[PDB]
Design a protein around this ligand. Structure first.
Ligand SMILES: [Zn+2]
Ligand SMILES: [Zn+2]
Lengths: 188, 189
DNA sequence: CGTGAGCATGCTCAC
DNA sequence: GTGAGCATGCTCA
């Protein structure tokens, strides 16, 4: 997808380095099922009060783009809910008291929204912890299809203020697969 | 709880083997998902009328024996129904007009019973076609746990007249895995 | 119909 | 827990 730093210079950042690892040249996150991944939110200017941060997954390949990304039938019933996220949601937020799990009434896409909070004292960014509740390979779900996670900064009214994204692969061996995908990578 | 021929010499045989292939030394059937496997029903003397044949799967390993063998959530919902077999049943019967899919309300175990039919003209055994609707590897299902299929010959009152059983591995490459398991089995020293 | 090599990807098991 | 190697479904010459 195409980014939109917008008027507040909004963009993501990732801690360097397993259970979670980010590849810059690929701008792809590799992580294990249900493991927390910290994502940094950077702005050049403080967003208006009441701004929100939304996370959503969409299939990368054009031919799958219209299909809603949801958990596979096995994990959807594996009883591992936190009492807040609906079972069919792939993406969950950890360490936040006000998550909102939504489903678009038109597209039926799932998303989890959290309030935007300015960086703590001494920091240049604010961190949000995300979890993916299915592997990219789960049958009846992502089915080995790569996805993109779209992080959008919106105002209290739900208007787009900024947007960024990264590709993600939820798998058993993040470190192994990242290396495999980086050496198989061809540029131009 | 043990194979046994009974008053009718009831035992199983298998057309010999790939899609579907049996290994005598292993007494194990290696087949592909949803592919028909013909198993032969042998008897020393014809059993009474009203006799039926039931098929049931159970996990081989003791620490799994108590868990019901059923289809994984993905396949249970993958609309491949045939209009009769409940969607969660692993074993289905092919080419038989009236199979009966039951679920023991006490053990919750699935089984499919079919009426017993004497061999055709010029044959010594009767053949029943089964097929498995999940791979042994299905996550949420057998999850790589080996199962045993138990075929029982019972009369119209449900009384056991004989029993037999074989191991089964439903997989993508039956020939590759049969060879591997037979190779590994030879290592009994 | 019918072949076979290599790989993708969750799992298991020594050090 | 850390790297090696296996188990097992899929892709495609
Ligand atoms: Zn899943
Ligand atoms: Zn299955």
């Amino acid at each position: 997808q195409k980014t939109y730093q917008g008027n507040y210079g909004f963009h993501l950042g990732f801690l360097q380095s397993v259970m979670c690892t980010y590849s810059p040249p690929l701008n792809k996150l590799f992580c294990q099922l249900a493991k927390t991944c910290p994502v940094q939110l950077w702005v050049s200017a403080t967003p208006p009060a009441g701004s929100r941060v939304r996370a959503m997954a969409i299939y990368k390949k054009s031919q799958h783009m219209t299909e809603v990304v949801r958990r596979c039938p096995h994990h959807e019933r594996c009883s591992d809910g936190d009492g807040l996220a609906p079972p069919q949601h792939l993406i969950r937020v950890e360490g936040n008291l006000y998550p909102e799990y939504l489903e678009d009434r038109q597209t039926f896409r799932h998303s989890v929204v959290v309030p935007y909070e300015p960086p703590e004292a001494g920091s240049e960014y604010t961190t949000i912890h995300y979890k993916y509740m299915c592997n990219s390979s789960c049958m009846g779900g992502m089915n080995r299809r790569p996805i993109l996670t779209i992080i959008t900064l919106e105002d209290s009214s739900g208007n787009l203020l900024g947007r960024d994204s990264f590709e993600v692969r939820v798998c058993a061996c993040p470190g192994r697969d990242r290396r495999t995908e980086e050496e198989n990578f061809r540029k131009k």
